[PDB]
Amino acid sequence: SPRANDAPIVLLHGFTGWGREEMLGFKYWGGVRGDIEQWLNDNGYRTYTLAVGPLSSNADRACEAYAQLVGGTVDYGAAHAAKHGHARFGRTYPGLLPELKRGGRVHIIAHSQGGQTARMLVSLLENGSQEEREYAKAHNVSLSPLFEGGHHFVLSVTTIATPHDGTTLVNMVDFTDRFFDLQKAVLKAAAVASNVPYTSQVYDFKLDQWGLRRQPGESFDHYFERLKRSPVWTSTDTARYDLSIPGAEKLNQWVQASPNTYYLSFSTERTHRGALTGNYYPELGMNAFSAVVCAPFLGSYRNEALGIDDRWLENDGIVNTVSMNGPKRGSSDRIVPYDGTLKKGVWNDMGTYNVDHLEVIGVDPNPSFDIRAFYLRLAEQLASLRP
Ligand SMILES: [Ca+2]
Ligand SMILES: [Zn+2]
Questions:
Q1: Which ligand is nearest to the CA of 76?
Q2: Domain Lipase-like C-terminal, which positions (predicted)?
Q3: Of all helices (H) and strands (E), which one includes residue 91?
Q4: For residue 202, which of 213, 212, 190 has the smallest C-alpha distance?
Q5: Is there a catalytic annotation at residue 222?
């Protein structure tokens, strides 16, 4: 497979994922195994890392990704912003790859939620947003080029353990919510952290658009009343909604595979099936948090009404394996098993790997998994793609 393009690679993390300047240099992409970006760069593959909202909707993360790539101030869209009640504009970036404005292409490699974000970015680049176009013209406000349509700079999207159909882990959270609302707890924690010096050097929640921080002149009384009125607490404009079974399908109904882009999917499992129940159980070696908290639910929760059947029980500790090969629920995308030749406009299913959600990015150890070879082989396939 000879090298047919020299397009750069960008890495795109999933839910909770953090940038290279965060977490004391402990890399999301590589974890305890090393630095994946550096492995790629060392082997002749130009690679950069994106850092978007760890807890934000794919829509918000897509706009952030766009800005970080070509440069400029993040623009969530006037219509979207009005609808969800958060700021329209966000952070300002100088641009990682302005060449993309001048005919350059890029490969995106994404993990978990990042796969949803990457699909959405491609859809927005290709087709823009009709709602944002109409709103801008109707109200006479500016429009981000992201919503124009007619941009084609993404050559490939690779997803690793992505919940294209959602994960039933959100269903567990729906149950737990009755006694412990996890979304609200995390947001309250982020609101506190926003007021504490230095914390964002360790972990940057990137929730500026909700204004969780006390503003310069603001009394605690004003602040508290202002926070009480924020729509953020019960918003569906979050990663949680997009990761859920209903939310992922909603995403799938408009975010489709572009005919100009190669899509690769990698699936993951770290479980074994019980002979009597057909339930799936975490293998020894699965990271402890997933093994105790998530895997038991993922491997036993059924909802025949929703079409959550026995096929949903195999998992990698965070996401149901069947969700990973490509979007299916509410989707018209085609998914084909890899046959030695990568095809445009369809999901190339590259197979299922016996590795858990965190092991596949090296955050959890697994000496049996040759993670270097995994990513270098992937880079070689992407470089083989004919533009
Ligand atoms: Ca492990
Ligand atoms: Zn938003």
A1: 2
A2: 5-366
A3: strand 89-93
A4: 190
A5: no
Q: What is the CA radius of gyration of the chain?
A: 20
Q: What is the resolution of this structure in A?
A: 2.0
CA angle 22–28–31, rounded 5-degree value? 110
Active site (annotated) includes residue 272: no
350 CB burial (10 A radius; 0-12, 13-18, 19+)? buried
With tokens 């190339």, the residue in question is 348
Q: Of 75, 204, 316, 349, which is the active-site residue?
A: 316
181 is catalytic: no
How much distance in Å is there from the Cα of 287 to the middle of ligand 1?
5
Q: Cβ-count burial of 101 within 10 angstroms (0-12 exposed, 13-18 middle, 19+ buried)?
A: middle
Give the separation between CA 260 and CA 360, rounded to whole angstroms.
28
How many residues can be counted in the chain?
Answer: 387
**Ligand 1 ion: Cβ-proximal residues, 5 Å cutoff:** 285, 364, 366
Which method, experimentally, gave rise to this model?
X-ray
Dist. CA 65–CA 59, nearest whole Å? 10
Distance 292 CA to ligand 2 centre (A): 32
- Cα 159 to chain centroid, rounded: 9
How far apart are alpha carbons 116 and 106 in whole angstroms? Answer: 17
Catalytic residue among 56, 112, 123, 331: 112
